[PDB]
Design a protein around this nucleic acid. Structure first.
Lengths: 81, 79, 90, 89, 90, 96, 95, 78
DNA sequence: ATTCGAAAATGATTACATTCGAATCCATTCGAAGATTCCATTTGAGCCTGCTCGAGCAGGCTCAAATGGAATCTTCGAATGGATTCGAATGTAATCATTTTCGAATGGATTCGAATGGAATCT
DNA sequence: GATTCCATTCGAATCCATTCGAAAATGATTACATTCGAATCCATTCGAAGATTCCATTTGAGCCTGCTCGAGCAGGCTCAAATGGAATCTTCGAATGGATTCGAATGTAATCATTTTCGAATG
């Protein structure tokens, strides 16, 4: 279902709230364009989907179908993160 | 408490789009942490860019430049 | 024009001007560098557009959408290696 | 300044029946600009390495060889050489 | 030309009784050239983004902030600002 | 000189000349961009050299070698994040 | 005389402390020339070119083996297998 | 000529990586990956050589090719 | 489908950069010797990996309830964006006066050696 | 308690780093000429706070059942040791080629003043 679609899989209001709260650490009284938040959301979803693909590869390597935090850690360590 | 707005269904959908069959119950907190780290990096760079231009508003091109700096180019928002 | 002499659709004078505006120190740009660059850009554009249009016509649809562009790029190995960007809406 | 005119002309050349939206047109503009900046940077570096001032079609050819993969590079080199030969004559 | 004179001056500043070999000197020269090229390129890009022509210390400061990891960029910014202030005072 | 006026060891005039030589189009470079850049380069050089000299002293030798540079760089999180290059002559950090 | 795993740890300690090159130079030179003959004929090489190639190659291989060891430990083993090399190379972006 | 990279040499390269036990099928895999890497770098080095109208491959061509590959190296002129 | 400020094309003119021949002179290639040292092969053994089976765990799906998101004006005062000086600063042009780079030369620092007295391993 | 490995410990020739000298770049100073980046003023957007919903998504609870995990063998495969046997490495010497410099001689790109068209904003 979600592989063949092109939509955004996160609600926009919570993501916007989180983006503003994170940005509060770098400069107070900050404004945002709607396009900036939309671009941030697109990039974030792309990043998470790619990471989950790598995580699934790691899970298969260990003869499982369930993904665990150790798979995320191995994938991120090999990627240099 | 704004990272608890990234819910279990959303993480499940993002994992399904990656071809994942089953999920452990401890994956959601890890996902929230990694998303926070990624967003912090990109937003730091974008705010640097908007501070150089002597602006108070973050624009889409600051985000595009920041992403290109991290090596994560994005088409469809300018450039 | 210069483009018609070369036999292209992309502009030679504008690309020459851009090339001049992106050279370090006090450098100069020849008139055939622009012709070469316009030919390369037109070739790559035509390749991408042809693949995307084939994908679109496989759906009995006229217009090309970002989903068609992503399907065309990801289904080709060379275009996959060259283009690693994220396509918004694909 | 954009490439919409020339992208549309090339599309009419390739697929005379299909159209294109505006989001796809913006994506194609981004793609063209990306490739242009890559080629220009490589050519400038090549000219600097040899201690030369002018950028010529040899620099562009070497940049295309270094940046494009496989048969893309071969066909691009052929197209560019044909264009330059038709231009100079 | 190279950077050996100034690298040796800095070394005698920080470790008065420690020497250095020639291979280490080559590696240090490579390191200095690498970082200088990175900063220069990024500053040029910043100047282009704002439709400017001159490169100033604002471009250099922004380049330093963008290129260096944190807790390393803060001290670098402090040192550069102190140097510019001392230079302009005279 | 300009370096002594700013209080530095690295050359302000030579770095100004290089900066001018690597600007796109017809670009101008101010006299304080060179001061800032020289300060940055001197700071980074001093940090790397101080760590390498500490590594050299721990091993009971006088001179600095590429092994000590590698040991200094890989033992620091910031320098490891910044310097991703390969150093010809210093192999690895001994681990398990 | 020594249990299996003793000398292995001794050599791990030995080669993580030295800084030399672990491949012989004549075979690597021959391999480099044979590979390069497929791009241009009658090529000449500086000695520094081959030395630089060897340094880069050895660095690459050691980093790859570190990633491979991580993959092997993930699957509760101490032996490294080709599947670990493939997984590391795929996550890296090579496969 | 790829068989001149012997199995003791690969064992040494694995020991410097912290590897304790080795499967018997690791050496052919290592030879393949090394061949791929070497071809990728040498292609760019020879391209740089040909642009300069030279017949000798210098160390700067190798350094530039590695820098293009994302595998910067220090100690050979850059 | 129209107008039009904007930019590209025409025609010389210089200087300026690039190309053509020599002339070395480094440095790459090539051939030879040989003595040790790496490598290859076999062997014997022990430890590690893989499979089965039961035992414990925990993920997906269903449903009823609650909750929060999306969506469309409304406005309003904040904030970019454009004009016109204008005042701050960069580059060009000569003239020195360093300064750094390329040569040679002995103080310390490094390297190779058998010797010997200690952690480390099996037994 | 008998190997084999580490870990200093003292001896000296050697390799190398750190001082010395001469001469060609090259900064630093002084004085214009003139771009270019700032400072006020005025327009136009555009982003934020508000309101009001139907509704569409999220939340526990639980129950089943599929999945992962732990224990015990069996074997099979990697390691450690010894003995020949190729072959790298160091040094040597000639011979060969081709990179760099340096004058002369072209090939050509940028900057003018006109003219014309063409791409972008608006329908």
């Amino acid at each position: 279902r979600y592989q063949k679609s092109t939509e955004l899989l996160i609600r926009k209001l919570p993501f916007q709230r989180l983006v503003r709260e994170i940005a509060q650490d770098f400069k107070t009284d900050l404004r945002f364009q709607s396009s900036a938040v939309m671009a941030l959301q697109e990039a974030s979803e792309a990043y998470l989907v790619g990471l989950f693909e790598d995580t699934n590869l790691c899970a298969i390597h260990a003869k499982r179908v369930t993904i665990m935090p150790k798979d995320i850690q191995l994938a991120r360590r090999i990627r240099g993160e | 408490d704004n990272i608890q707005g990234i819910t279990k269904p959303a993480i499940r959908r993002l994992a399904r789009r990656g071809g994942v069959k089953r999920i452990s119950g401890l994956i959601y907190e890890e996902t929230r942490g990694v998303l926070k780290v990624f967003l912090e990096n990109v937003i730091r760079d974008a705010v640097t860019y908007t501070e150089h231009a002597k602006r108070k508003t973050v624009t889409a091109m600051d985000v595009v430049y920041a992403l290109k700096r991290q090596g994560r180019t994005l088409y469809g928002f300018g450039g | 024009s210069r483009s018609q002499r070369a036999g292209l659709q992309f502009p030679v004078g504008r690309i020459h001007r851009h090339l001049k505006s992106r050279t370090t120190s006090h450098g100069r740009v020849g008139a055939t560098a622009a012709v070469y660059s316009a030919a390369i850009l037109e070739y790559l554009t035509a390749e991408v557009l042809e693949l995307a249009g084939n994908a679109s016509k496989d759906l009995k649809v006229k217009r090309i959408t970002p989903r068609h562009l992503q399907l065309a790029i990801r289904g080709d190995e060379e275009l996959d290696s060259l283009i690693k960007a994220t396509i918004a809406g694909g | 300044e954009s490439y919409s005119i020339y992208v549309y002309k090339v599309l009419k050349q390739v697929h005379p029946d299909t159209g294109i939206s505006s989001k796809a047109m913006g994506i194609m503009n981004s793609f063209v600009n990306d490739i242009f900046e890559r080629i220009a940077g490589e050519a400038s570096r090549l000219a600097h390495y040899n201690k030369r001032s002018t950028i010529t079609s040899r620099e562009i050819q070497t940049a295309v060889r270094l940046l494009l993969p496989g048969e893309l590079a071969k066909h691009a080199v052929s197209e560019g050489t044909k264009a330059v030969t038709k231009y100079t004559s």
